[PDB]
Amino acid sequence: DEANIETHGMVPMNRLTDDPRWLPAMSERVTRMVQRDRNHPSVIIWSLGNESGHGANHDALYRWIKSVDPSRPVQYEGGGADTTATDIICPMYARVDEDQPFPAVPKWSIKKWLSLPGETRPLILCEYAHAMGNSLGGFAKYWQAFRQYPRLQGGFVWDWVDQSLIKYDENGNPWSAYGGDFGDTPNDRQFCMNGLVFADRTPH
Amino acid sequence: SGIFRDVSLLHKPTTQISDFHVATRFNDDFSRAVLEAEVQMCGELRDYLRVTVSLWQGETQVASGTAPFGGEIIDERGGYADRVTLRLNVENPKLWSAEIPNLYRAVVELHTADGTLIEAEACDVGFREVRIENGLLLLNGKPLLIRGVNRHEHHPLHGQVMDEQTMVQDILLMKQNNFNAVRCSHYPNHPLWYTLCDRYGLYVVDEANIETHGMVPMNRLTDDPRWLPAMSERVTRMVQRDRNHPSVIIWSLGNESGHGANHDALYRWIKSVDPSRPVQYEGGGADTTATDIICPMYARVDEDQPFPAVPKWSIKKWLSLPGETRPLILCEYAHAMGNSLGGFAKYWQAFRQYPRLQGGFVWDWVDQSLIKYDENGNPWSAYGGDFGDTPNDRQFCMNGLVFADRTPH
Ligand code: NA
Ligand code: NA
Ligand code: NA
Ligand code: NA
């Protein structure tokens, strides 16, 4: 269960989440979610949101949840996937064997990440195996590693269904549309279609 | 068998230096060190006796301390009237490593207040700190990458007798071939080897002479209290002899002797006595309570070998097993028997990629072949069974990176 907080277009990403003036607004996004959903057995883990860097607001909220509901781990991937605001190493698109050593927020190979000095948490990818189009190449490599390494406990494929929308041609027939097809600009074209199934649920 | 190492006579005074230990501790950035030397005497105590410990950098004395005998109070019955500890401050010390084997000379003088020397003892001192922190083996605060090899004391003509020439040849070839460490497989070596490793610069794993591989199960003796005494001497006497060598960075409890409670007791004895070096031991699964470093033999890079009780996990996976945090350095890997070393690059790639994979010791340096002569007087390389020995394990003794005569494979 994840809080409705994403500030991906900010520069740097944590501009708002490190800002106390934004603490109240963020706080309601997390607290009201917990108050509403805390009795559902299916929710096993709380998430602080997505792609909003790592800011002090996050640390505050992570502690708030730990305090009010000790029954579920709290995870958050911003700021490098392994910050003080996450009980689980939960990267997005980290590779099996290959490191992607970006400055500040590297994406280590998952096998290596578990054993960096001092690291002891479990690792479950919050997003992996980007299913956009003709994709999922190398999926088996992830599964082989999840099964061999105890602390590699899986992940969440990105993602279930294509975000295509139906439009009608001059003759009224339907067709699958994406970014920019409504006159929207700027837009990100087909990047909105990354699922394992088409928008009508037919499988890819 | 036989008298295979030197025999000497040593004449000491009745009032003498009977032991001395040199320790070097540092500040946070190694810019300052304290050299502490505990000195013990045998003989008649006299108020006029003194001990001076002097530290030299080449022909320059850099520090010194002098004191009468008489240790600090240690318990309800007092202190050691027959010991003294000297503490020397050393600024900006030149640090020892296998890359730059900087050494100083410590001279320990037993003398009188008024200047007469009774006797002196001495050692080369390498200022270096060995510690494990956060899961990494650090030397002077930096994590090591062990390019090691296991080396037995073997000569095709002389058997197990070692000589300076051969030892020097081996160190030169090792260094020339980018090795930076050696494991004394599997017993303390001839004394001179330590002095050469200190001076030429190689990291050394000093191993006690205990191997009980042939017992069933392997720890039958090492788990038995009745053998604790014999075992203990093998470890304690090694430490007593080699503790002041800077090249020695890690102590090992022996080899292929399973994991017995005797190991645990001895591990703790070393940790108490010499907190300056980690203790390792591979027996019983390579990651027991008797080892500070996970130190498997022949574990593979990516492939698991899930043997009951004593599995050999892929080294990458071993590191991250639930609750594991230790560094991993293979005590033996890359079995160099005949046409071998296939897959060697796979190891290196892993070691470079994973901080906690800090290298290993190849098995092994030199082929244990022996020279024989045919009807004509022409020599040839012999192996097990070639001396009428049986049962025997044939060519199992030739696993080196070099032939017995030091020619490379
Ligand atoms: Na797993
Ligand atoms: Na997308
Ligand atoms: Na490494
Ligand atoms: Na052998």
Swiss-Prot record, chain A:
Annotated binding of Mg(2+) 2, by residue: N187
Consequence of substituting F191A: Decreases the stability of the loop 794-804
Signal peptide coordinates: none
Upregulation: By allolactose.
Residues annotated as the enzyme's active site: E51 (proton donor), E127 (nucleophile)
Family: Belongs to the glycosyl hydrolase 2 family.
Protein name (database record): Beta-galactosidase
Organism (species): Escherichia coli (strain K12)
Gene name per UniProt: lacZ
Residue range from the parent sequence: 412 to 615 of 1024
